[PDB]
């Protein structure tokens, strides 16, 4: 008996967000859950890992109820309808009836009872921009399908008052810290699965907006008023990353981010397609870059850098270095090195908020 009227654009906005998480084994998983309670329409999409909820206030008289309908089909019908049209939606004999202007649609349904949180340990509000920065500055370093399952995601840590993101695949690490002034009384850690965290970052579009965060023992919740995002957590312990951060780095290199990125990209063309190895030769004011492949093709480049100290010959995966440079927001970049067998520490020119660790390759 569920029935409501809605403007095309009012339905389209939450429908597009929700359909984005809809990808399926169970047939109901391909469906969007529609719930009319009073003058509110709720739209829910899930893949069992993440759940996204969109909400719309209904203007004209609406009859309550709940149903599930093919998410992609309803979104495509909504998108294809003329701009600003009023859509009439009703449930009739296990079918969804859609009317808009001279267009009529009948969709198959699945019962809402078949559609598939968690006390909060910590809850705080944060700028969408600050949370998105933490994810976007580190997400490239997360492992993908590593047997060490706890690496296939991002650590979100609250400590002191600081919110920190940590991502690693065992070869390289990315970390970003922001003083959000969150009272915690203890260090709190959560591992958000890779698919979930990447979805969340894409949802954080409000440059001026705020997001309410709830950290639970097995879930994370992000609320913006227009949407509620819920993700299950990776049930494991994140490695002791503090133990792998290089501390005694004696070789400080200051270089131009663009010059280094351009030289690494040029040399990468002639590096091994699988191993992506490049050789770095550091000396006073100079960085020599060399790359070669099995066909004996070779690329060489010399980059002027701010460096005074002893020589260093070190091997690196060029893609790992390019990944780091792609997230450095300053014109200059700091590389802190020691020996050929030890990690490179990378920072922005003017702050230590972001830190990148890259293990070398044997030459």
């Amino acid at each position: 008996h569920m029935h409501f009227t809605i403007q095309r654009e009012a339905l389209l906005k939450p429908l597009q967000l929700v359909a984005g998480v809809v990808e399926q084994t169970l047939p109901v998983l391909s469906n969007v859950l529609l719930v009319v309670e009073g003058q509110q329409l709720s739209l829910t999409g899930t893949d069992l890992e993440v759940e996204l909820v969109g909400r719309v206030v209904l203007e004209d008289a609406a009859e309550p109820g709940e149903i599930t309908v093919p998410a992609r089909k309803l979104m495509d019908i909504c998108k294809s309808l003329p701009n600003d049209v009023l859509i009439d939606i009703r449930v009739e004999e296990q079918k969804l009836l859609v009317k808009a202007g001279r267009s009529r649609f009948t969709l198959s349904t699945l019962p809402a009872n078949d559609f598939p949180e968690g006390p909060g340990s910590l809850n705080f509000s944060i700028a969408q921009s600050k949370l998105r920065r933490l994810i976007d500055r580190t997400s490239f370093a997360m492992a993908q399908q590593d047997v060490r399952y706890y690496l296939n995601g991002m650590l979100l840590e609250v400590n002191g008052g600081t919110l920190r993101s940590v991502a690693t695949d065992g070869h390289r690490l990315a970390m970003c810290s922001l003083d959000a002034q969150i009272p915690s009384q203890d260090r709190h850690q959560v591992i958000v699965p890779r698919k979930g965290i990447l979805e969340l970052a894409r949802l954080l579009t409000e440059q001026d907006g705020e997001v309410g965060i709830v950290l639970g023992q097995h879930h994370i919740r992000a609320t913006t008023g227009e949407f509620t995002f819920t993700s299950k957590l990776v049930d494991g312990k994140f490695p002791d990353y503090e133990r792998v951060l290089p501390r005694g780095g004696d070789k400080l290199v200051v270089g131009d981010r663009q010059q280094l990125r351009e030289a690494f990209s040029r040399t990468a063309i002639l590096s091994n397609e699988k191993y992506r190895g490049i050789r770095l030769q550091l000396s006073n004011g100079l960085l020599k870059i060399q790359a070669n492949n099995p066909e004996q093709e070779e690329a060489e480049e010399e980059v002027q850098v701010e460096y005074n100290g002893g020589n260093l010959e070190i091997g690196f995966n060029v893609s790992y270095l390019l990944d780091v440079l792609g997230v450095i927001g300053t014109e200059q970049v700091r590389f802190i090195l020691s020996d050929s067998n030890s990690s490179a520490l990378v920072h922005e020119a003017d702050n230590d908020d972001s830190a990148y660790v890259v293990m070398p390759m044997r030459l």
């Binding site: 065992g170 070869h171 792998v244 293990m359 044997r362």
Partner: peptide, 5 residues
């Protein structure tokens, strides 16, 4: 390639 752990 070397490992962090």
């Amino acid at each position: 390639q070397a490992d962090l752990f």
